[PDB]
Ligand binder design. Structure first.
Ligand SMILES: [Ca+2]
Ligand SMILES: [Ca+2]
Ligand SMILES: [Ca+2]
Ligand SMILES: [Cl-]
Lengths: 302, 301
């Protein structure tokens, strides 16, 4: 089913909808434009408004679909399970093809940022015929990150060891001052004169202040250290079939620590990538440069 | 020395503030008679962690229980940007200075947690002053950071949280000091109830001071930075005095390393065993801790 929730107050030309999937979950989505389907999927601690600066341009040549991850934004936030399956990337990925089935699309182009990229990686493996191409933003594979855990990794990515502690520790810490934690996750990501306005920060905060999101976020991270790694090892011999593009911040953390394109070679057939003049979020920090790079890739995929 | 009255938790012991040569003042509990035996606590306790074993040990020794700088009721001086102020070299200097001021020469040493990391540096910087060492539930700092892997960073996540740049961890702990103390103590102990509510209350009295929370962080930052430099600068050196390792079979350090093995690479004369407890045998299984320490001190002294 589709319920219409008015126009997007943040992204001109896009309509907000609540879509009920066959797995009984309801997701919040913003849709705009016309043409071949393009899904842009946000990460943590954002929601789909992270695409507000690029989405309208992209909508000129595509039907742009901006979902809120389960547990995030305004999508449902189901209570979880002890193995964290409910927030595994496999379940998240399944949410994405079921949404597409519900909007009537068959094959689609996919772009994913932060958590959204991890969902995408699993999406491209579980449903290789559905995805025409992939663009993963500012991430190296989940299994690779944890496998290379060293003093330096654990220091620079300390949340990857804090957000995974057993319930309710991280949930309790964050709840002490949600805005403070959000600032760390956002001002650490940018650090280049105001890529996130007070209005956009308030919108992300509005969502982040819901303890149900706080918990989903921790379950997502817990899954990434457990069930997601089980799933990723079970089919480690498999490779992403569609063309893959990596876009990452030359001044972000992952770009300063690893050869980004190099981390995706064993995981995919045809790969390519480049560093952008920003930190963690090129769609917010250097939108115009981001669009150009995404357009070239999308239009090159036959 | 300035008398502060009888200890309210350790029968027969007196509390004192002692002013060292480096201008610092440390709180110390002293009881007993005989040769000096230093027992140095770690994080997030104070010298009261030794309340269960100290009076028994006081029968044959003059037992000295300092609060590390930055902890308990000792001074908590302003730190420096390199973290040298809370480095294990400096902390060790406080100890030898404390002994000079109490008039003692050579002494026996025991260190738990941060206290044992201090003793490591102590035996290396002042080999003549130490008759013997016992380190409790610790593998050397350099070995721990070097073997950093997923389960380690997960099990000992605070080694990556307390070292985040100022003022992040401090701000987070300040939101609810008692909550974060409780999680530490719960994660340390395996023998449930080894830290009574009264004992916990005494640790909380000190931990809720923001000056203590900052110093704790500085201490961990030292261990991730300047401490490792010192350890590399004399990597060929080895502890000469007899070394004993007592750790908890049921805890993290016990399950991740060959404890005795990690120390053989740092010392000439090494022994030790796992006790049926978590991180703090002096509180979780006092009788077996006393028995084990006494045989070592007797076989050596
Ligand atoms: Ca593989
Ligand atoms: Ca005390
Ligand atoms: Ca416990
Ligand atoms: Cl991520």
């Amino acid at each position: 089913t589709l319920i219409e929730c008015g126009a997007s107050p943040f992204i001109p030309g896009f309509a907000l909808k609540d879509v009920r999937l066959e797995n009984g979950l309801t997701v919040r989505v913003a849709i705009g434009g016309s043409g071949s389907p393009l899904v842009l999927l946000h990460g943590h601690p954002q929601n789909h408004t992270t695409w507000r600066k690029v989405a309208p341009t992209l909508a000129q040549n595509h039907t742009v679909i901006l979902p809120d991850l389960r547990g995030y934004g305004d999508s449902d936030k189901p209570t979880s399970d002890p193995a964290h399956r409910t927030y595994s990337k496999r379940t998240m990925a399944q949410d994405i093809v079921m949404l597409m089935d519900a909007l009537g699309f068959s094959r689609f182009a996919f772009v994913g940022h932060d958590r959204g990229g991890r969902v995408g990686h699993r999406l491209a493996l579980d449903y290789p015929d559905r995805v025409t191409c992939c663009t993963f933003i500012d991430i190296a594979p989940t299994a690779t990150m944890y496998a290379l855990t060293d003093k330096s990794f654990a220091t620079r990515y300390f949340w990857w060891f804090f957000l995974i502690q057993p319930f309710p520790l991280p949930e309790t810490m964050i709840a002490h001052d949600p805005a403070f934690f959000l600032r760390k996750h956002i001002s650490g990501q940018l650090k280049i004169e105001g890529a996130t306005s007070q209005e956009a920060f308030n919108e992300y905060l509005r969502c982040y202040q819901n303890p149900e999101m706080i918990h989903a976020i921790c379950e997502d991270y817990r899954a990434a250290a457990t069930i997601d790694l089980d799933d990723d090892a079970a089919d480690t011999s498999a490779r992403i079939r569609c063309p893959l593009q990596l876009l990452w911040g030359g001044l972000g953390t992952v770009g300063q620590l690893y050869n980004v394109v190099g981390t995706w070679k064993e995981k995919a057939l045809n790969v390519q990538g480049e560093a952008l003049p920003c930190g963690h979020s090129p769609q917010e920090e250097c939108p115009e440069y981001f669009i150009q790079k995404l357009q070239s890739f999308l239009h090159s995929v036959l």
